């Protein structure tokens, strides 16, 4: 799946769980566009070594914060739309 | 890919 451009650029507001996890990569404010949540997010995927090493496009989340924000044991990075509904689920 | 090139992709 993939999302037209003009959806990366809406505003949204992270709930506190969500907040909390991006807080952890350095973003700092309460508002963001959905291109800088996914930024954060990936950063945080990143950091804590959640992506598989030899087909990096899965990403393990069972034992994360990550994982009880999603509600997935794990994910593809190629389902676009499923990562999208995962953050607007997990806004205020 | 690298995962970076992967979420690059979703990003943009
Ligand atoms: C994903 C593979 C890892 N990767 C490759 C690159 C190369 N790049 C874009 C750069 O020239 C520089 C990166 C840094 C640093 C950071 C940084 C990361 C960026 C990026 O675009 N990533 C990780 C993919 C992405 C895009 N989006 C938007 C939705 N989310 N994730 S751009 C950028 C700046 C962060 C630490 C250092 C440079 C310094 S130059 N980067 N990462």
């Given at each position: 799946s993939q999302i037209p451009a003009s959806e990366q650029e809406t505003l949204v507001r992270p709930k506190p769980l969500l907040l909390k996890l991006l807080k952890?990569?350095?973003?700092?404010?309460?508002?963001?566009?959905?291109?800088e949540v996914?930024?954060?997010?990936?950063?945080?995927?990143?950091?804590?070594?959640?992506?598989?090493?030899?087909?990096?496009?899965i990403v393990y989340c069972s034992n994360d914060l990550?994982?009880?924000?999603?509600?997935?044991?794990?994910?593809?990075?190629?389902?676009?739309?499923?990562?999208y509904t995962m953050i607007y689920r997990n806004l205020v | 890919l690298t995962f970076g090139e992967y979420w690059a992709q979703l990003a943009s």
């Amino acid at each position: 799946s993939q999302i037209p451009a003009s959806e990366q650029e809406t505003l949204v507001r992270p709930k506190p769980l969500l907040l909390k996890l991006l807080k952890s990569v350095g973003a700092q404010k309460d508002t963001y566009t959905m291109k800088e949540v996914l930024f954060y997010l990936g950063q945080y995927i990143m950091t804590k070594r959640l992506y598989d090493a030899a087909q990096q496009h899965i990403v393990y989340c069972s034992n994360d914060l990550l994982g009880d924000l999603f509600g997935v044991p794990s994910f593809s990075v190629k389902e676009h739309r499923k990562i999208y509904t995962m953050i607007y689920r997990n806004l205020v | 890919l690298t995962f970076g090139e992967y979420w690059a992709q979703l990003a943009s």
